[PDB]
RNA sequence: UUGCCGUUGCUAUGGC
């Protein structure tokens, strides 16, 4: 991306929070 | 079939031991029949390119001749002439043998194990159990070559030697 | 007292009825042997009245419902019985389901202004898987895999269901009780549609074997397997007679299977954009054929994977009538999600202009038999009835009905009431994912639920 | 099962009679007697068994029909 | 000028699936982005198919700097969720790879297609 | 026409 | 009318 932002950065990580919780 | 000009050329022999060796081929019977097949379909298009462009023999039998060799699946629907035709190998006719087919689709591992499966009543085209290796599927006989269904591979109990030995564990 | 006598009393009932009832006797009992005359005969969908239909979403606790179907009594004018399996269940509807959760259930659907009521169920699980291995041995009572389909017997004594588990459980229907199960006997013998031949207990299962199966109920046997598909055969469709119908998906050939005569029809879309374009001078190349029904004996419809709607006729291998994109093209994918590019214009470029847009498919398609109207179904979130005209040359959009939201996995109707008056229920089962996977982006407003609609006739 | 299925069915008066084309589907099994064939087209076109005759049956290579 | 580039029309997608629906059945089809970038560095891929679709997009533009420098020929396709539907999988696929294989019963429908990938490149 | 049937 | 959670009525549809 030639100018990349932080909206995928936020719910990937949000992804990754629901992950955690589960195990 | 008939017998070559020459037999015994060096490259000759070689060709036939690359040939059944690829190709799983009993013996230089089988390729002599193939090559026969071969030379007439070729020199009946020979005969063909002779005559005159639209000759009505020529565009007749040139496109029944190549529509049939489209069937048979040797010659590519993008290849519809009769160039094309002359430039066929025997190679194209081998691969349209079922052993290949048993063998590239999966079905067999390898050229004999599809000889053995096919000579040993396992595979069916459609509703018909095949055991003459030496057929020649067309292109919608392709897709169909399956297990015949009375195969314990393909969906019937197992065979002899599996309950045999089924059996003797049993007492 | 003598049997004959009974008949002779029955038909002598029969006649006070029609007489009672009342030229308009001699119409009625032409057209209660129209049906073995393979042509349409059932004209209504003009009198239908859509605007003012009663819709209504009843939700249940399946996730994913798969396919549902229906059973209606009708009275035999030959031996003057109801189909109904016994005197409790005279005059009862019911309507079965299956889904991925590997549930059977039945519900009463008699009473057309309420709502369907649960009776009874059974759940499969991994209770059931089988130990030995071998497709012969599998013959367990239970589902333990997806379940797909499922079809009740006309004679309303049994319901038969399949699914990932390849086999073919015949239910019970008062108690859901497990008589009899078929294997495939197939590695990849995956039953995905079911048809029961009309008043008969002929059974006609799709395999994604890339065969046919085909079977007697009333037997507990296998007859005949049938070939010549390219693709695994997703749907089927059966009428009164035997010439069932198919579709190959990715082979996009309708296929009409004749089994008294053992020869087989072939039909072919053939459509491509760029004749299209230049007759016209968004059409997208068709897909696969993933939904068929036939309206009457010499005429049948698909459902496909461009969204396009062909009507067929057996005289004709190419499709005679066609209506692309009939239920839309798919919402444009977002700007702000395509591209993580702040810059809006950048996004956009992504979008490709309207290149990456396609259009909806058509996941259910059910014709009421031998009438001139028929609906198709797919997640747009309404059911869309169509009219066919009088010389079956063409047919046009009766209408819509939005209550739905989710991908409409199968669609059934059922009539009631006296012969000049009837009131239209359409039953469709729906989910918020693909029977066959579950390769749908979730749809918001989806819900795995029944959806019901009442239609009445007038004017 | 056995299916068992008629076509090309004759009417012949004058010989008083019946021809067709009986077709034997019988998967898992090596074929039917005649005698079984008899008594039960009997029963399906109804007439007496002695009045049922049937002939020249071959089984397809391959087995089941 | 678009990321996703070059596109099939609506015809050389036609073809492109129908080589990957067969191609999973005869076992020579590799499905998804990691199996792609598997393929790639091991050199045994004839060419890639790619969701132009993809959310986001950029989650396999990674994979064409692969495909050219090891000069495999690739392409872009509408709907990835039509991919996952020819190549079997219950779930969508954004990305997808033949395996080589001169054995295989199918080697003249994926040289065709070859072919025509290589014009539109 | 002829007619079908079915036994065991 | 729902596995769970809401809204809207005295019934209909929104989230997982």
Redesign the pocket.
Known sequence: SEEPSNVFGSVLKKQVEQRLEFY | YSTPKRPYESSRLDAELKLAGEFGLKNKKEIYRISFQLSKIRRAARDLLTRDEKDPKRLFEGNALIRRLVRVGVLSEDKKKLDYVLALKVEDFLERRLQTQVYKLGLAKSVHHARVLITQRHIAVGKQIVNIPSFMVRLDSEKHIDFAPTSPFGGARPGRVARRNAARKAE | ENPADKRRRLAKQYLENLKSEADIIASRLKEDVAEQQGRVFRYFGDKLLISEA?????????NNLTCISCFQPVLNKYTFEESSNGDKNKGRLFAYTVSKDLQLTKYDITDFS?????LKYAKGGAKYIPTSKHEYENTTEGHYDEILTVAASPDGKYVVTGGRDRKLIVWSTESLSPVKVIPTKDRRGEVLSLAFRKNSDQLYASCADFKIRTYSINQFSQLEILYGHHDIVEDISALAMERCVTVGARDRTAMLWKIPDETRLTFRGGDEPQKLLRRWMLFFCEGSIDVVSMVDDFHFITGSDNGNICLWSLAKKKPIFTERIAHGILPEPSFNDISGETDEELRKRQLQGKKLLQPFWITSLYAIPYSNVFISGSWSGSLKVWKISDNLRSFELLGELS?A?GVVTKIQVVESGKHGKEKFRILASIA?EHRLGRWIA?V??????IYSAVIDQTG | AVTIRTRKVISNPLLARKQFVVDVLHPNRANVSKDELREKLAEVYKAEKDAVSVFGFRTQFGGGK | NPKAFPLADAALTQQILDVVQQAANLRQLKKGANEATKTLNRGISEFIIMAADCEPIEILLHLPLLCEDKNVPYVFVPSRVALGRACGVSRPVIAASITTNDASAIKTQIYAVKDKIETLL | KGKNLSFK
Do not use: D, I, L, W
């Not at chain 3, 918001?444 to 639920?449: D, F």
């Open positions: 009663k819709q209504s979403f009843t939700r249940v606790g399946e309420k709502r369907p009521k649960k209550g939201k918020k979730n918001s407003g989806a819900r795995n639920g």
